[PDB]
Amino acid sequence: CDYTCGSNCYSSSDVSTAQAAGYQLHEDGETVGSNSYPHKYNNYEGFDFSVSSPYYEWPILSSGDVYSGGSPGADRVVFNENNQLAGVITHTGASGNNFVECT
Ligand SMILES: Nc1nc2c(ncn2[C@@H]2O[C@H](CO)[C@@H](O)[C@H]2OP(=O)(O)O)c(=O)[nH]1
Ligand code: NA
Ligand code: NA
């Protein structure tokens, strides 16, 4: 696994595919789903991302398909304004409504 979010296993191609879809919607000024993804990720957790902000979060799904407006699940891809990958985060293993980084 390139990224492990709890029990979910993601390759760098699964991440690139998810990011490309979130980035396109972001540029278009449109969102999908009841929680309106993609949307800004503030970095309250204080992850040390090596690319610049602003950051946006978009769901990445364990099933392998691109998020298509249903349940976002626990996992997210985080990307910035230049379509650079910041990281992959999850609610799995985090307390409250915080996130932890996938490893
Ligand atoms: N845990 C977490 N939630 C965030 C972050 N950025 C935005 N959100 C949350 O995502 C949702 C969409 O904006 C809001 O509930 C917002 O929470 P706050 O209301 O606390 O800002 C972040 O860095 N961490
Ligand atoms: Na809009
Ligand atoms: Na809890």
Author numbering: 2 to 104
Paper text:
To provide easy-to-use automated NCS restraints, it was decided to adopt a different approach that uses interatomic distances rather than structural superposition, extending the ideas used in the SHELX program. The restraints encourage NCS-related chains to have similar local structure, but differences are allowed to occur at a fixed cost. The restraints can also be used for another commonly encountered case of molecular similarity, namely that to a separate already determined structure that remains fixed during the refinement of the structure being refined.
